[PDB]
C-alpha cells in the first residue's frame, strides 16, 4: 500500500513489511501498537482534515534501544568555561504490519 | 527520515531569445535555471540545472538612462589602473559580456557557481551552434 | 626472498645521503652499480659499500644469483648526532650538529624459473 503516519512528534512514510526507529514508545516488545495517527494512502486518502479518522497503520514493537552517543561540548573563550556531556536518544524500533484504511 | 538524492541524471538544454527582454529581469531567470531550483530534484551541492543557450544577446532592453550611465569597472593591479566602460560601449563591442556579467553576479560565488557559468552559452545571435536539442522557453 | 645490509653510524648527514639512495631505489644491481659509480657525491661511496655487501649476502648467505638482484627497498634512518662547539663572535658559542646516518639496502630477485 503506502501511508503517512504521525508518531512521536514526527511523521513517517510507512509501508507493508518494514520500519526504522521512532521516538520512545511506552509500550513493550511483547505488544502491538496502532498509529491511528495517519494521513494519505497509496490510492489517495489525503486527510481532508487533520487525520483520516478511520484508517490506521499497525506496527509491532521490535524493542527499545539507545542511540549512538552524541557529544555536546560547550566552550566560552577567555572565561575558563567548558562543559562536556554525553547523549543517547532512547528509541523504540518498530515493524510495520498493515495499513487499515 | 526519507532519502532524496536524485543521482546522476542527463542534463536538459534550453534555448532563449533575449530579443527585447530587459537584462536583470531576464538574467535572474537564467540563474534559477542555471542552478535548477525550478525542479524538485534540487540539490545544493551538485550541478544539476539546465544548460542555457541565450541567443539574440545585444539588442537587449535596459530602462532609464542606463546607456551612458551604467558603467562597468575593471581593475588591473597597476596604479591608476581602474577602467570605466559605459554600457553603450559594451554593447557596441563584446555585447554578450553584458548579459554574462549580469548573470554571473547572480550565481553563488564558490567552485560550483563558477562551474554553472560554464553551463551558460551566450551569443550575439540570432542562430546558435548547438544541435543537442534545445527547448525554447520564455 | 631478500638480502639485507645496513651500515650503522656512517657520519654523513641523512638528508645528504637520502639524496643518492633515492637514485638507486628500484634499479637493478648492475644498473645501480654504474649509477653511484659516476654519481658526484660523497654519499655514493657509502651507499655503494652497503649495496655491494647486500649483493655479497644475497648470494653467499641465501643463494640468489648476482643476476636477478635489484634494490627492492632502501632508506636511510637518522642516528645520534654529534654535538660540537662553534666559536661565534662576541663570546657566543654555537652548537653545530655533526649528524649521522644508518644506511639500509635490501635486495631481491626479478624473473623466475
Amino acid at each position: 500500500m503506502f501511508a503517512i503516519v504521525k508518531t512521536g512528534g514526527k511523521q513517517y512514510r510507512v509501508e507493508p513489511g518494514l520500519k526504522l526507529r521512532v521516538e520512545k514508545l511506552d509500550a513493550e516488545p511483547g505488544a502491538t501498537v496502532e498509529l491511528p495517527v495517519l494521513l494519505l494512502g497509496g490510492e489517495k486518502t489525503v486527510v481532508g482534515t487533520p487525520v483520516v479518522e478511520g484508517a490506521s497503520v499497525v506496527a509491532e514493537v521490535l524493542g527499545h534501544g539507545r542511540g549512538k552517543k552524541i557529544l555536546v561540548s560547550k566552550f566560552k573563550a577567555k572565561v575558563q568555561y567548558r562543559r562536556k556531556k554525553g547523549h543517547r536518544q532512547p528509541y523504540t524500533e518498530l515493524l510495520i504490519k498493515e495499513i487499515r484504511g | 527520515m526519507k532519502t532524496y538524492v536524485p543521482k546522476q541524471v542527463e542534463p536538459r538544454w534550453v534555448l532563449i531569445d533575449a530579443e527585447g527582454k530587459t537584462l536583470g529581469r531576464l538574467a535572474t531567470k537564467i540563474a534559477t535555471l542555471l542552478r535548477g531550483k525550478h525542479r524538485p530534484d534540487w540539490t545544493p551541492n551538485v550541478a544539476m540545472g539546465d544548460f542555457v543557450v541565450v541567443v539574440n544577446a545585444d539588442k537587449i532592453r535596459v530602462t532609464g538612462k542606463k546607456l551612458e550611465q551604467k558603467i562597468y569597472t575593471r581593475y588591473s593591479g597597476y596604479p591608476g589602473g581602474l577602467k570605466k566602460i559605459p554600457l553603450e560601449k559594451m554593447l557596441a563591442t563584446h555585447p554578450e559580456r553584458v548579459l554574462e556579467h549580469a548573470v554571473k553576479g547572480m550565481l553563488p560565488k564558490g567552485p560550483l557557481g563558477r562551474r554553472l557559468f560554464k553551463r551558460l552559452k551566450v551569443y550575439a545571435g540570432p542562430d546558435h551552434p548547438h544541435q543537442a536539442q534545445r527547448p525554447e522557453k520564455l | 626472498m631478500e638480502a639485507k645490509a645496513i651500515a650503522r653510524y656512517v657520519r654523513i648527514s641523512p638528508r645528504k645521503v637520502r639524496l643518492v639512495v633515492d637514485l638507486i631505489r628500484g634499479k637493478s644491481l648492475e644498473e645501480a652499480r654504474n649509477i653511484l659509480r659516476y654519481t658526484n657525491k660523497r654519499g655514493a661511496y657509502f651507499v655503494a659499500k652497503v649495496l655491494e655487501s647486500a649483493a655479497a649476502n644475497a648470494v653467499n648467505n641465501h643463494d640468489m644469483l648476482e643476476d636477478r638482484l635489484y634494490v627492492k627497498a632502501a632508506y636511510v634512518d637518522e642516528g645520534p648526532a654529534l654535538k660540537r662547539v662553534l666559536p661565534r663572535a662576541r663570546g657566543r658559542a654555537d652548537i653545530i650538529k655533526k649528524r649521522t646516518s644508518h644506511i639500509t639496502v635490501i635486495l631481491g630477485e626479478k624473473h623466475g624459473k
Partner: protein, 59 residues
C-alpha cells in the same frame, strides 16, 4: 641573531614542498665501444683506453 628573522616556523608541508626540486638526476653514461663498460660520453675511461688515447695499464 640580527635584523630579519623568520616570523613563523615553516610547517612540514611548506618545508618539504620547497625541496620538490632537490631531487638528483642520474649520471649520464653510454656503453664504451671498445669494452663492455659504462662511462660518461665524450670522456676517456680506464676500462677501455680509447683506441690508444693515452690509456692506463694493459698487457
Amino acid at each position: 641573531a640580527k635584523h630579519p628573522v623568520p616570523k613563523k616556523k615553516t610547517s612540514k608541508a611548506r618545508r618539504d614542498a620547497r625541496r620538490s626540486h632537490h631531487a638528483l638526476t642520474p649520471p649520464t653514461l653510454v656503453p664504451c665501444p671498445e669494452c663492455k663498460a659504462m662511462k660518461p660520453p665524450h670522456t676517456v675511461c680506464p676500462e677501455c683506453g680509447y683506441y690508444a688515447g693515452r690509456k692506463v695499464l694493459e698487457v
